[PDB]
Point group: D2
Chain length 233, copies 4
């Protein structure tokens, strides 16, 4: 009945949009969830809506010490991590010509560096048989104006799921990537998208649940497009 | 707890292996299933195993008139199709050098021709928002000795997922390919496979259920690799 | 200066468009070319235009005995084949609903059936270390309204390059697919093409030249998109 | 004979390996070449081997003021760039467990930050209709033990070719990536490589030449694998 019964899940960007929708679906499937985001007010609000089986941890995953404090809380409250969904950060655009060193730093810090140490630091807590989701994007395989660094970073994320599938196979930890298209989170993609609509956080959440749950038990290293077909035709 | 409650499914190659594993998972999820396959004896054993909510139909998907009769049964019995799973066929191996006309026809008639007509002919019963799954293979992206025609054929299937995605969008019908690696069916693939083992048919059924169910409602046109990481690393 | 000096090429579809453009460039590169195609009027025209170091052969390469007659001539006049460029056939359009058996067979006959037996009966003649080129298409990776059978067959063609890479590696024969986008031969593709225009036949001939020549000696089983960026952004 | 007559090329990583083999081939094709690299002693050595039509420049392509100086030199002596081939950097291996902030910085500064600003700063000098080549890698689509950051960064590089195809199309600048497999520099990657050997640096220069010349005039945004079949079968 309950596809994640008593598993423990950690979700970064767990504050809002997709990461929050996932938390909620996780909790409905019977998991216990750590939502990890940066603003306290927004964590409290999130924890309040999810309502049960949820701890809110304030941390910036681009900071080594924040991560250490995170895993000391997960070890103390729950002891182990069965699932890690890495859903942090947002898009900042810049054509090649405008890219500044600091803009490139902002993107890469959040999408790659942050992610690497997030997953690195979770290894001691990860159970054998566990599941790690990275968040890549349609941007990873498209040539989209002013998405220079975002897209490059997301392609690199997709790549980490292959490598880590190789490195973590002895522990039987599956690593996969989700590549969302346009997902409604508080225009001309919708136009060139076969289902003709933006997606709902809830649908991304379900695709993530597939990767999280026992149903994707023979699924490893993939890149799961959830884009209503954008990149597929 | 019932991901396909009251949904009607049609599964070709439903008499054994993956077809039959999926037919069991579907019924466990509340669907009504039509299993379709060539041997009557095998269809009966399969129906008895499933146990309930099943009709067995004898049809060879490479014969137009057999498909006509399948669909008339379906229509009279249930009146609509929510999920079509196309899983007919088996591998036959010949190197370029050994390829004959009949060998070429056995592979393409089953894997491509018959798929085309199955789906064409299901069109009038398929609801809007229904889900169509095709069976490709790791073979469709690999260069495997003596797999000439089977690989080419399953690459042709993965392609029709893309075109049907565009053609069928007006009806919101999702078309997606699954691509199994090595599956247990009554060992070298397994050697270079990160998961270190063949898949169980149930694990393949669970991936197809994903595509069949509403958790994949924003997912269209894709190639879902269920190969333990074979082609991903 | 002469990148193919004294090499023997066979080109199918050599009477027009890409095939003919490629026969001209291969003769300018110092090759001796066989052009193979169905129209006698068309072949003699092409042969006059090409000028020198060309033999026209009227053959329907989906007929096994025409192939036999073809290679019997190649072997008699020039021994062995250094370069085989397979570029026979044209698009035919039908939506899923409109596909008939006849339309399907024309498509897969020209594109997949004849190509297999073409390259099959070429084997005893191909020199070790030679180069075989397959014409697949952007269509092979796209979901183009009413391109059902043509896209599937061109995706099957791309798969055969991977398969024959493996099978023919022992004789160091390279097999690569070229995947043309819109070429200019006697619209909206051009709206989404970054280069903003259709390709010239000469430009596709230049890309095939690359596969044919020593410049691609460490290039094998690839899909080379020649589409002004169409499938890449 | 001379496929780059009177073109100006700039190569980063020009002091050795692929850069150096490519600079040699470019001069053989009548280009004027600027070899760019860190080592003085290494560069004068390289320039001596080329022997003509070449200016060595000493720059660390990860320092912005080094790029300013390189481009002011190019501007003064040649005025224009027709070809920019980016080939700076080397692998360093670390498993996820071993990754340090410094190791991460080395790989991404050299492969991605450095790549970005090199191209950004060539923009005013690059002729309209020029060719810009990037060095990705087979590692960009593989899950290779201990290649975490290098693979991820090469995949970054691959995506930048898509994005720059889009952003630069108005100027008709083609941007494509080359992705080498095992290339012989000063044991089993070759194990299941179809060609049964590591590639020569000359073979990779020839491939890069293809991308710099008119023969790829309708090729934009591509990933060109030069890897003897590794990633293709």
């Amino acid at each position: 009945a309950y596809r994640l019964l008593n598993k423990t899940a950690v979700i970064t960007g767990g504050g809002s949009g997709i990461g929050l929708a996932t938390a909620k679906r996780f909790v409905a499937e019977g998991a216990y969830v750590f939502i990890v985001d940066v603003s306290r007010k927004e964590l409290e609000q999130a924890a309040a809506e999810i309502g049960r089986n949820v701890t809110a941890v304030k941390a910036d995953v681009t900071k080594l010490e924040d991560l250490d404090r995170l895993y000391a809380i997960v070890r103390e409250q729950r002891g182990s991590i069965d699932v890690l969904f890495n859903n942090a950060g947002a898009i900042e655009q810049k054509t090649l010509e405008e890219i500044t060193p600091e803009h490139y730093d902002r993107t890469f810090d959040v999408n790659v560096r942050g992610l690497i140490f997030t997953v690195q630091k979770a290894l001691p807590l990860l159970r054998d048989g566990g599941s790690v989701i990275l968040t890549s994007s349609v941007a990873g395989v498209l040539g989209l104006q002013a998405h220079d660094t975002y897209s490059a970073a997301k392609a690199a994320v997709r790549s980490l799921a292959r490598t880590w599938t190789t490195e973590l196979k002895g522990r039987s930890i599956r690593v996969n990537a989700v590549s969302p298209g346009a997902i409604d989170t508080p225009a001309k993609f919708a136009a060139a998208t076969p289902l003709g609509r933006v997606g709902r956080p809830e649908e991304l959440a379900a695709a993530v649940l597939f990767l999280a749950s026992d149903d994707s038990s023979y699924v490893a290293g993939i890149e799961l497009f959830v884009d209503g077909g954008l990149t597929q035709v």
